[PDB]
Amino acid sequence: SNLTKDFFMVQMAASYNQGYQGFNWPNCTKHYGFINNFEPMSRQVPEYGAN
Amino acid sequence: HIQVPQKFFAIKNLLLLPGTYNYEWYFRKDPNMVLQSTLGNDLRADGASIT
């Protein structure tokens, strides 16, 4: 996704005390948490040039 | 843009001390092994490639 290496680590260290060890799916995820609400996605559009 | 783990059990959660270390690894290019398919056809004949 667009979310950077700089700032995904800040969100997982604040909310779930991860970082410096393995990123995993955490045990206790709240309703207003980060990892159960984060939804990355991707599409592919053509070039749309002259032709 | 992917992030692959380290699955070898001896050095997957090891704690290092100071020192300078070399870390070599070999990756795959076989599209039948790298990729998955729903129908399960050959991906070498039906030409799929990863670079």
DSSP B16: P
Tell me whether A22 touches chain B (CB under 8 Å): yes
Report the C-alpha gap between A16 and A8 in whole angstroms.
12
- A15 φ/ψ angles, rounded to the nearest 5 degrees: -80, -35
Which residues of chain B does A5 touch, with a Cβ-Cβ cutoff of 8 Å?
none
Q: Which residue of B has its CA nearest to A4?
A: B1
Q: What angle do CA B8, B35, A39 make, to 5 degrees?
A: 85
Q: Which residue of B has its CA nearest to A42?
A: B1
C-alpha distances (whole Å) from B7 to each of A18, B12, B22, B25, B44 are: 19, 6, 18, 12, 26
Which residues, 6 or more positions from A19, have their beta carbon under 8 angstroms from its beta carbon? Answer: A9, A12, A13
Which method was it determined by? cryo-EM
